[PDB]
Amino acid sequence: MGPHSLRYFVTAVSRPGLGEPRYMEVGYVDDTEFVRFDSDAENPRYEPRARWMEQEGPEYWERETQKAKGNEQSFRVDLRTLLGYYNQSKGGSHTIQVISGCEVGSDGRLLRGYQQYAYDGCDYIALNEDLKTWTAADMAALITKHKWEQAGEAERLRAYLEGTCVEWLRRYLKNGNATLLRTDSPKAHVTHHSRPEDKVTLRCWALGFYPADITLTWQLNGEELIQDMELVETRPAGDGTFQKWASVVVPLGKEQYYTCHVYHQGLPEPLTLRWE
Amino acid sequence: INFDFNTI
């Protein structure tokens, strides 16, 4: 019933020689991409990535594109400013990434507000949980922190975190509800692999589930074999659902003593399977 | 909707 979040993942990557830096903005509602902006395009526009976003009128798309257009200028300047802070040359390609947004609880009250920057893949600065102070990761970030402290940026930011973010989150949740809050139970099965030895391979498959979060465990009559278990990272099937598998190496003939447990939020009760 | 980012 719980907590939800609205987060924007921002990226600016310079490409000296070729033109201007590539800029992107991606919004996620509970981990699902719903809006997207990419400057490496024809006539770059804020674009809906979920069909339910289409209910937002032209106003929304113009205002959010204008907003991204200005953010894009801030990031171009950030890119040139950092090169000077670290004394790097102008030929190289560098990146800046940001994660901004909030986590809200069931009561609709703000739980957590995020604002973290990374330069070239390493942490640079981040707003603290108090929502008033920043933590710098290097000497270069103290300059930024100092500037932000002087201008009262955390305050500007906190105002967006607790107001605009929260309010919009609620609205996004109201309009994408059915799709956002949908659940597709995973279809499970077990397969047998051998390679002419005295050992077999039991692989537990979890397919076509949504959301992505899932847990698969192999048991030997009560024992969760986490040490002797081999499994892959959850991966996108490409159609909105996900896949995952967990395998264990079992003694030929001792198949029927091993059990796979499928924990997913669409399941009324956890799944339990064996070779068949 | 996203925020209006200042610079570093």
Partner: T-cell receptor, first 115, second 112 residues
Framework: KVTQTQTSISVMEKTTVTMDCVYE???????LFWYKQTASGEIVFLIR??????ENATVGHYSLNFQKPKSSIGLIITATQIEDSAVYFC??????????????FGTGTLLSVKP | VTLLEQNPRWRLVPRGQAVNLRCILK??????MSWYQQDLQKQLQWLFT????????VKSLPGADYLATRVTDTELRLQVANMSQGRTLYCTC??????????FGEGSRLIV
């Protein structure tokens, strides 16, 4: 977007004056400012109000009366000196189209202080 | 006296003559620089904001043609032409792009 109805004001030193400012914005976060222009043309920054700051900004003998619900941001100069005679400007940021640092200015209200 | 250095202070602009204004930032804490005009009725109007050296823009208003260029990190230029009426040009500086105070230079009084 920014309107200051009064054209001019005339008072005697030591008096308290209130310059009116009414604005129109659809932004959730917004920034209001008061500037002053002397005979010379110098445009001087006086005081500002953040739409998200719950309190009325106060600086020296300049005080603001921010009435969010009425969209009013009057400038109150308490107990006036001859030095305060000038054109008072009210402004609000109102960027669009890639403007970056666009302030919208009211037409200004002239203030006079007789010795 | 401000954080900016504008020259000329004033200038007589002949009929078909273009004129050039220069603005120098004296405090590097405020790199966002703009050009504002103030008419004879005394209405301030924003014209340009150019943060990065190389930035150049052309804008034509009723009464004046303008071409602005951020030359260096501390230098903002303006070329004004086809101005049928007097007006003063002010340079402003700010510490960042959104929500930071703008501070005014002393201006360049263009007289006709």
């Amino acid at each position: 977007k920014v309107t200051q109805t009064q054209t001019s004001i005339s008072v005697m030193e030591k008096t308290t004056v209130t310059m009116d400012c009414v604005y129109e914005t659809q932004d959730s976060s917004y920034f209001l400012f008061w500037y002053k222009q002397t005979a010379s043309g110098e445009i001087v920054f006086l005081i500002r109000q953040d739409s998200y700051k719950k309190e009325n900004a106060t600086v020296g003998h300049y005080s603001l009366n921010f009435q969010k619900p009425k969209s009013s941001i009057g400038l109150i100069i308490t107990a006036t000196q001859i030095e305060d005679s000038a054109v008072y400007f009210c402004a609000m940021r109102g960027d669009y189209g890639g403007s970056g640092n666009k302030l919208i200015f009211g037409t200004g209200t002239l203030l006079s202080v007789k010795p | 006296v401000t954080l900016l250095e504008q020259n000329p202070r004033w200038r007589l602009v002949p009929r078909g003559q273009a004129v050039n204004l220069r603005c120098i930032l004296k405090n590097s804490q405020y790199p966002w620089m703009s050009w504002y005009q103030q008419d004879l009725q005394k209405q301030l109007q924003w014209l340009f904001t150019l943060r990065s050296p190389g930035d150049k823009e052309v804008k034509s208003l009723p009464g004046a043609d303008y071409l602005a260029t951020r030359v260096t990190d501390t230098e903002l230029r303006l070329q004004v032409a086809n101005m049928s009426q007097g007006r003063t040009l002010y340079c402003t500086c700010s510490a960042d792009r959104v929500g930071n105070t703008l501070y005014f230079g002393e201006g360049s009084r263009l007289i006709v």
